[PDB]
Amino acid sequence: GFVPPQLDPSTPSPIFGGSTGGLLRKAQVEEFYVITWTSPKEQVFEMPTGGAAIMREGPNLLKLARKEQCLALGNRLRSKYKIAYQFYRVFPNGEVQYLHPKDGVYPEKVNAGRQGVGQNFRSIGKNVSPIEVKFTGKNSFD
Amino acid sequence: KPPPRGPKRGTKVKILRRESYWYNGTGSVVTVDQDPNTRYPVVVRFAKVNYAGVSTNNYALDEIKEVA
Amino acid sequence: MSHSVKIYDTCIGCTQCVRACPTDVLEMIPWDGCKAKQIASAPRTEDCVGCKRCESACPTDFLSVRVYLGPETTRSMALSY
Amino acid sequence: MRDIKTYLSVAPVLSTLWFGALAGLLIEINRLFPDALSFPFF
Amino acid sequence: DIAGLTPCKESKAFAKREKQSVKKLNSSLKKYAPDSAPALAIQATIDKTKRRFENYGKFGLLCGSDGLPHLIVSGDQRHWGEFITPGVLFLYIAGWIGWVGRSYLIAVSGEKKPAMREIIIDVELAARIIPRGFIWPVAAYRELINGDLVVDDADIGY
Amino acid sequence: DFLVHHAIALGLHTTTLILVKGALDARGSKLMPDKKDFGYSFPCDGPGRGGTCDISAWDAFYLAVFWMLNTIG
Ligand SMILES: CCCCCCCCCCCCCCCCCC(=O)OC[C@H](CO[C@@H]1O[C@H](CO[C@H]2O[C@H](CO)[C@H](O)[C@H](O)[C@H]2O)[C@H](O)[C@H](O)[C@H]1O)OC(=O)CCCCCCCCCCCCCCCCC
Ligand code: CLA
Ligand SMILES: CC1=C(/C=C/C(C)=C/C=C/C(C)=C/C=C/C=C(C)/C=C/C=C(C)/C=C/C2=C(C)CCCC2(C)C)C(C)(C)CCC1
Ligand SMILES: CC1=C(/C=C/C(C)=C/C=C/C(C)=C/C=C/C=C(C)/C=C/C=C(C)/C=C/C2=C(C)CCCC2(C)C)C(C)(C)CCC1
Ligand SMILES: CC1=C(/C=C/C(C)=C/C=C/C(C)=C/C=C/C=C(C)/C=C/C=C(C)/C=C/C2=C(C)CCCC2(C)C)C(C)(C)CCC1
Ligand SMILES: CC1=C(/C=C/C(C)=C/C=C/C(C)=C\C=C\C=C(C)\C=C\C=C(C)\C=C\C2=C(C)CCCC2(C)C)C(C)(C)CCC1
Ligand code: SF4
Ligand code: SF4
Ligand code: SF4
Numbered sequence A: 001g002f003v004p005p006q007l008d009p010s011t012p013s014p015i016f017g018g019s020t021g022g023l024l025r026k027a028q029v030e031e032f033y034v035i036t037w038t039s040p041k042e043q044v045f046e047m048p049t050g051g052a053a054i055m056r057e058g059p060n061l062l063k064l065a066r067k068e069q070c071l072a073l074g075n076r077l078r079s080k081y082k083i084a085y086q087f088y089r090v091f092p093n094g095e096v097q098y099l100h101p102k103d104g105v106y107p108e109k110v111n112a113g114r115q116g117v118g119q120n121f122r123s124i125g126k127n128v129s130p131i132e133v134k135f136t137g138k139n140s141f142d
Numbered sequence B: 001k002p003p004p005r006g007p008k009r010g011t012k013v014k015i016l017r018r019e020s021y022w023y024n025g026t027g028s029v030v031t032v033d034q035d036p037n038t039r040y041p042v043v044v045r046f047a048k049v050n051y052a053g054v055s056t057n058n059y060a061l062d063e064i065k066e067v068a
Numbered sequence C: 001m002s003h004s005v006k007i008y009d010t011c012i013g014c015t016q017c018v019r020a021c022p023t024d025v026l027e028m029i030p031w032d033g034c035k036a037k038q039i040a041s042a043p044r045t046e047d048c049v050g051c052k053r054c055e056s057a058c059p060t061d062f063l064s065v066r067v068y069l070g071p072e073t074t075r076s077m078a079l080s081y
Numbered sequence D: 001m002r003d004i005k006t007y008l009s010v011a012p013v014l015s016t017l018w019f020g021a022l023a024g025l026l027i028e029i030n031r032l033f034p035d036a037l038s039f040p041f042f
Numbered sequence E: 001d002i003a004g005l006t007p008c009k010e011s012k013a014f015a016k017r018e019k020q021s022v023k024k025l026n027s028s029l030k031k032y033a034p035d036s037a038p039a040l041a042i043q044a045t046i047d048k049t050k051r052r053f054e055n056y057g058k059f060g061l062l063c064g065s066d067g068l069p070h071l072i073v074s075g076d077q078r079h080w081g082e083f084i085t086p087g088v089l090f091l092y093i094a095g096w097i098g099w100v101g102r103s104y105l106i107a108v109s110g111e112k113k114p115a116m117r118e119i120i121i122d123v124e125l126a127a128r129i130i131p132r133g134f135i136w137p138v139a140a141y142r143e144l145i146n147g148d149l150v151v152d153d154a155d156i157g158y
Numbered sequence F: 001d002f003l004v005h006h007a008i009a010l011g012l013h014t015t016t017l018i019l020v021k022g023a024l025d026a027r028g029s030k031l032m033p034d035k036k037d038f039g040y041s042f043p044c045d046g047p048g049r050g051g052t053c054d055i056s057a058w059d060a061f062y063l064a065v066f067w068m069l070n071t072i073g
Helices: A024-030 A067-080 D002-008 D011-032 E013-029 E037-056 E084-108 E115-119 E123-146 F002-024 F057-072
Strands: A033-037 A044-046 A052-054 A063-064 A086-090 A096-098 B013-014 B026-032 B044-045 B056-059 C004-007 C027-030 C038-041 C063-070
Touching: A033 A067, A033 C063, A067 A086, B013 B044, B056 F057, C004 C038, C027 C063, D002 D011, E013 E037, E084 E123, F002 F057
Parallel strands: none
Antiparallel strands: A033 A063, A033 A086, A044 A052, A086 A096, B013 B026, B026 B044, B044 B056, C004 C063, C027 C038
């Protein structure tokens, strides 16, 4: 897979006063997220957790608590200003993980190379009754 | 020349499938894809809309009765 | 693995779920079982939050993607604290 | 004109006039037969 | 005299109720002019409830131990002017309505989108379908005879 | 006593209706024909396709307990 990650660097942050939507104990103990994109021009955009702020020129760096907010902001940036982006996960050990594209091409369209994790080749009605599988680990949809 | 499967056109069909909204239902064929790599090549319109708002879906031939 | 996603061959490869997946779970892969020659896949069920909006879109006979519930975790619960 | 006819054939107004007529019939019967408890005809 | 219920053509508590009612009405009556239209309507209602008591004392109404009418629906047509005849009359009316509605719907089913005629009735077709009520017992009858009233294994769609 | 007995029969029949609907329609109705694979008590099956609040058979027992208390009262 010639789809390498980008190893999220430490680049400046958007101009924002700092507010009660930031991180909490969770981010400092378990995990948090960082979304990163390059911007075309200093404009205004509403952060997910409150108010609005301005971005800068070049690459950006925003931190957030949960992946859902990051991806919501990313879809907003892709449907409002037509720019690409990534977001990374961080662990308190110091690890950094690359999550969303996994190839660079959106998961919206086809790109061979992805495996087939979690298919069942039978219509929904073919599932069986729990009695046939009771007292076991298996379930009907498996 | 290779015999195209599925009814011809306009043939009112009776649904044999159980896990659809139209089980024992009377629909109308709109086309059938002659490709033998399909797995549900017929498609049927109805006069009763289901819960999801849809009014069309796919089937194989086994779940059809070519009623008339 | 907290929740669970299943996909069935009544998938017409229309690709509404992925466009509506909130937390980047599903995707498409090349198949041979529809015109679009593409079927769903769920290799990212960890971040599966559990909202049914995905299968609230699939316009098939009854459904083609199911979201079976299971145990809970820290990320499957939208926790932010 | 025909537009106002098709509009008048819309269920709300038709129902209102029908119910008004029925209620008028019932109240007139009650007027002409006060308290009308039994069937003193047969 | 079913279970001892005497008709209030002969009981007493009925007379007591009647007396007390007309008495309170009359005592209320003497607070206006003897000719004022409100007093006139008061006297009108007085004589009206009086003749009501009279009518009740004309049609075999078996009458409670407390001075109240009490229906006798046990099946004996002796007291039938309460249930049997009004029952069959209302059954006739209900069959009328049910049959006319069913016939209208069965008719209008054959159109492009019958919903447009289910929200906005075909008042012409409605008028030429409605008076058929006089046929509802017999017509449906033949239907069941010819089995054209019910269906066997057509459930959804139509 | 006649009127009260009729009200009691009403309560009986309607509570029976609630419970029997919960029993027979537990395997699945056209709203969710494959319900029999979700186990007994589940929150719901999503807000789409018409909304599916209070559809488990546990929810049927739930909606019946009210009428049971009412009839016994
Ligand atoms: C608990 C669950 C179990 C199930 C539920 C069971 C619960 C119990 C339900 C009980 C329901 C009982 C209801 C009885 C209502 C009877 C209505 C009625 O009999 O009504 C009859 C009354 C009669 O009124 C009384 O009529 C009396 C008749 O007097 C007669 O009797 C006199 C005696 O001296 C004379 O001899 C002479 O015969 C005659 O004047 C007196 O005039 C009284 O003053 C007067 O109040 O009204 C009229 O006559 C109206 C005009 C005639 C209408 C009918 C004939 C026309 C056919 C239908 C045409 C369409 C019209 C439809 C109208 C539908 C409604 C009526
Ligand atoms: C003429 C039309 C018509 C006919 C023949 C029937 C017939 C029946 N209905 Mg029903 N129904 C109707 C309309 C009709 N319905 C409408 C419009 C509604 C919605 C308000 C319902 C709601 C309904 C329920 C909720 C239930 C039934 C049930 C039943 C069955 C037992 C009878 C009963 O309990 O009714 C009781 C009486 C009613 C519910 C009153 C409804 C009748 C309406 C007011 C008449 C409509 C006439 C039309 C709209 C006006 C236009 C006139 C014309 C000019 C076009 C029986 C097959 C029961 C069943 O499943 O039995 C197995 C049952 O549980 N019906
Ligand atoms: C607008 C409109 C509407 C509404 C409507 C309505 C609201 C209606 C109502 C109606 C009504 C609400 C009616 C009522 C009526 C009433 C009546 C009609 C009454 C009568 C009475 C009488 C008639 C009486 C008489 C008398 C006297 C006076 C004294 C002597 C004796 C006697 C009793 C006879 C709709 C929704 C459709 C839609 C939109 C439009
Ligand atoms: C003007 C106007 C107004 C007002 C209105 C109103 C207020 C109205 C009312 C109305 C009404 C208030 C109505 C009512 C009606 C009622 C009726 C009409 C009733 C009837 C009844 C009957 C009909 C009964 C019958 C019966 C039965 C069912 C049982 C058996 C027997 C008998 C017969 C009893 C306003 C300002 C707001 C606005 C503008 C306009
Ligand atoms: C005058 C008179 C008479 C007659 C009467 C009549 C003829 C009446 C009619 C009446 C009528 C014509 C009635 C109707 C009614 C109807 C109704 C009342 C309905 C109801 C409905 C409901 C209640 C609903 C329900 C539901 C649904 C559908 C949804 C789901 C759930 C439920 C179940 C809740 C007689 C001779 C008897 C006696 C004397 C007086
Ligand atoms: C008289 C009387 C009595 C007796 C009663 C009885 C014995 C009853 C029975 C009842 C029964 C045992 C019933 C059954 C039934 C069955 C069936 C199966 C039904 C059916 C129905 C139908 C079929 C209808 C149809 C129709 C028409 C015709 C019209 C409307 C529309 C329609 C189409 C729905 C006594 C003395 C106790 C009390 C008083 C009253
Ligand atoms: S749950 Fe349904 S909607 Fe929420 S992410 Fe997993 S798939 Fe997309
Ligand atoms: S389920 Fe509906 S949306 Fe998801 S893949 Fe199959 S068709 Fe496309
Ligand atoms: S309320 Fe109705 S819709 Fe909202 S979640 Fe519970 S079930 Fe789904």
